[PDB]
Design a protein around this ligand. Structure first.
Ligand code: HEM
Length: 152
């Protein structure tokens, strides 16, 4: 699958709203993800004790993890599908060290999309919704293949 330049433009236009407050979006996305999927919280040894929303918002460690994922994903999206080099070390760490099943990445994509609908609807209309679905599907397809390429 291959996105048009117009689709990438819609993706990166709403992504620019995320990067206006990366830490705040990271908190929102991760808190949504951890509440929807408590099994994912269990994968973070430094976070897995967290329970309340106030506790999650107070955690400097959670905030750092939100910045790390959104910064890496932003760099990948700006490759507009030419992301082989970026996906290799991510597959290695997430498959073999963090032990993240591939389906968890779909739950992360769902949390991104939920936060974009809530925060930035004026930049997330019908066309941009479709384009973001496609960009995250392409990311998931390609990283799932990288998981397999490493034997996981
Ligand atoms: C449900 C989805 C995911 C889970 C559960 C997960 C889990 C983790 C964990 C446990 C760590 C190690 C944290 C630490 O102890 O310092 C980590 C690191 C990291 N994650 Fe994720 N991750 C997910 C998705 C992603 C995605 C989609 C990206 C980028 C597009 C990403 C980028 C990173 C980066 C850059 C690091 C630091 C370096 C590395 O270990 O590769 N993560 N992740």
């Amino acid at each position: 699958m291959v996105l048009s330049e117009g689709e990438w433009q819609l993706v990166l236009h709403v992504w620019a709203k995320v990067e206006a407050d990366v830490a705040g979006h990271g908190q929102d996305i991760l808190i949504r993800l951890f509440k929807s999927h408590p099994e994912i919280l269990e994968k973070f040894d430094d976070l897995k004790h967290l329970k309340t929303e106030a506790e999650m918002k107070a955690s400097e460690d959670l905030k750092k993890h939100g910045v790390t994922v959104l910064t890496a994903l932003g760099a990948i999206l700006k490759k507009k599908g030419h992301h082989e080099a970026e996906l290799k070390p991510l597959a290695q760490s997430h498959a073999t060290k963090h032990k993240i099943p591939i389906k968890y990445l779909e739950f992360f994509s769902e949390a991104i999309i939920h936060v974009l609908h809530s925060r930035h609807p004026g930049d997330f209309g019908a066309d941009a919704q479709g384009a973001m679905n496609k960009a995250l599907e392409l990311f998931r397809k390609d990283i799932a293949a990288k998981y397999k390429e490493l034997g996981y």
